[PDB]
Structure 1
Amino acid sequence: DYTNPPWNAKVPVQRAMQWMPISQKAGAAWGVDPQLITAIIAIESGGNPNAVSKSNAIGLMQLKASTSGRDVYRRMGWSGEPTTSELKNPERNISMGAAYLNILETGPLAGIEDPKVLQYALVVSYANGAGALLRTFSSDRKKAISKINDLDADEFLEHVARNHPAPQAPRYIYKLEQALDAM
């Protein structure tokens, strides 16, 4: 049961909303929905810009220097990876998070047609990687996308809950809907 325990979104979303001006700016620059950015902030850090997880995920959107941080650096045309200090900067963190969502949308998840299925695919990919998601459909990226396109949002969630190896995957979707209802 990925909905258990329940997650009350009120506090973490209202805290995350204090970052909205940055989220709207970053979202407009990268073509990313600021409500999704706000949801991710609420879910990942509860709006605490200094959060540091066990696995060294840092800041408002819990970006990890060696994984998503480096992916965004490559998208900017840079080598290396951000520092912890850089990831604690709220503006830098949220803009990098927005950039990462754009990278997912325009790279591995390109061709998803339904914008609600795409929303769910984004959070699941954000949480455990686009590869882990797509491989539950096919080792071939295009066949994977074609299979995703055969599903609606509620069927996508069912698939993820049954077939995704990470329990966090379907729970992210549940939390997303909890977060959205609180905005």
Structure 2
Amino acid sequence: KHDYTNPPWNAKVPVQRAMQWMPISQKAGAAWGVDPQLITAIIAIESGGNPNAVSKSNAIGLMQLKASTSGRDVYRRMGWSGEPTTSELKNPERNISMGAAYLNILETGPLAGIEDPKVLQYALVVSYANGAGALLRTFSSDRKKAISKINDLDADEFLEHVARNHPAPQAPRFIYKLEQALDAMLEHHH
């Protein structure tokens, strides 16, 4: 039902800029066990590689972290009180390293025990934007059953499900731009 491929989106230039940061993304991905291509994909989608991007919501920087939510979440994962400042989120290394942490948090928490890497990946990008909870809720009210129900799908049926079930239009959209972004990235030798 969500017309999620319209308009088309040219990954080239936003991935090009995102790729500026790939050395950090490589290090960040490595440290947190996150696919560096995913990190770069997210940077390209959320900020188009612009480290000073700032949303209506006051989400900040390359990976559009919000200090009160994902910021706070990552601070607690590291044993820290409080939230990162705006200033620290505009730092490209701290920002990316924090997005990586946050992706790791989603993978080892809300989304734990997804089998297929590719669905996992799609789940991450939709969770990252519009929240793991809202995603699971589209399957079932109980987490464990929603996850069993996700493992009964392959990536394309997952995308179909998000397209028809997720309230947020940007959820399936992100999966489309993920794939455009991964395509642009084959033109960059690791």
Q: TM-score range by the shorter chain?
A: over 0.9
1:96 CA displacement: 0.2
How far 1:60 sits from its partner (Å)? 0.4
Rounded to whole Å, the distance in 2 between the matches of 1:105 and 1:52 is 25
Q: Output the CA distance in 2 between the equivalents of 1:152 and 1:47.
A: 30
Q: Which runs of 5+ in 1 are unaligned?
A: none
Distance in 1, matches of 2:136 and 2:79, equals 25
The answer to whether 1:133 aligns with 2:112 is: no
- 1:66 pairs, out of 65, 68, 77, with 68
How far has the Cα of 1:135 moved from its partner? 0.6
Distance 1:110 1:117 in 2: 12
Q: What is residue 35 of structure 2 aligned with on the other side? A: 33
Identify unmatched segments of 5+ residues in structure 2: 186-190
Match of 1:16 in 2: 18
Find the aligned partners of 1:160 and 1:80 in 2 and give their Cα distance. 33
TM-score between both structures, scaled by the size of structure 2 = 0.95
* Cα distance, 1:140 vs structure 2: 1.1
Task: Determine what percentage of the aligned residue pairs are the same residue.
Answer: 99
Distance 1:134 1:107 in 2: 12
Q: TM-score, normalization: structure 1?
A: 0.99
CA distance in structure 2 between the aligned counterparts of 1:103 and 1:174, rounded to whole angstroms: 23
Select which of 122, 125, 132 maps to 1:123. 125
Aligned partners of 2:93 and 2:9: how far apart in 1?
27
Query: Deviation of residue 169 (structure 1)?
Result: 0.3
User: How big is each residue's C-alpha offset from its partner over 1:43-80, in whole Å with a ceiling of 9 and x where there is no partner?
Assistant: 01111111111111100000000111011011111111
Instruction: Report how far residue 35 of structure 1 moved.
Output: 0.3
SS of structure 2 residue aligned to 1:182: helix
Shift of 1:161: 0.4
Residue equivalent to 1:7: 9
Residue 143 (structure 1) aligned with residue 148 (structure 2): no
List structure 1 runs of 4+ shifted beyond 4 angstroms: none
Root-mean-square deviation over aligned CA pairs: 0.5
Number of residue equivalences: 183
Counterpart CA distance in 2 for 1:145 and 1:51 is 33
